[PDB]
Amino acid sequence: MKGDKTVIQFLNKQLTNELTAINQYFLHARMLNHWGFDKLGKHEYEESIGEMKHADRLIARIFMLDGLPNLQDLHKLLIGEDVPELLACDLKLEQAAHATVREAIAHCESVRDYVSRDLFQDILDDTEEHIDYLETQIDLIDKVGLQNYLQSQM
């Protein structure tokens, strides 16, 4: 079918964000395993997998709209050097992606690509849940203290 060109552009922009998040979260996950914080690492690994599923949905939609999915580009990965930075890096990445998705929904609405809007709404819901999780973890560090927070992730 012939999709709106700007909708395909938003699908490819959010795809670049998802590919960036797959790699960041995958790297962070294996880094947490390497550090011996496997409980947090497992949660991080599942977030990487969730971004792979988002990327897969975007790619399928782009083909349906007759566009070419862009798997070539990546944003700069935000890599933490300890657990508090790791969480803040992931938070910054999801906050940036949230903005793309919110603008994509308003665009889909305006060009009456209402099925692409429902894909982006699903993504936005998952993105806010992940932001809420990250904000909670960063606040827990301060309340339980870093050493206890790290102990709980072993």
What is the binding site for ligand HEM (CB under 6 A)?
19, 22-23, 26, 49, 52-53, 55-56, 71
Among 7, 24, 32, 54, which residue interacts with Fe ion (rule: CB under 5 A)? 54
Among 35, 43, 84, 100, which residue interacts with a second copy (rule: CB under 8 A)? 35
- Of 27 and 141, which CB lies nearer to Fe ion in the complex structure? 27
Nearest in space to 42 (alpha carbons), one of 31, 56, 29: 29
Binding residues with Ba ion: total (CB under 5 A) = 1
Q: Is 51 in the site for Fe ion (CB under 5 A)?
A: yes
Nearest in space to 56 (alpha carbons), one of 94, 88, 14: 14
| Burial of 136 (C-beta count, 10 Å sphere; 0-12/13-18/19+) | exposed
* The entry of ligand HEM, Fe ion, Ba ion, none that residue 51 binds, CB within 5 to 8 Å by partner kind: Fe ion
Nearest in space to 81 (alpha carbons), one of 34, 38, 20, 23: 34
Q: Is 24 in the site for a second copy (CB under 8 A)?
A: yes
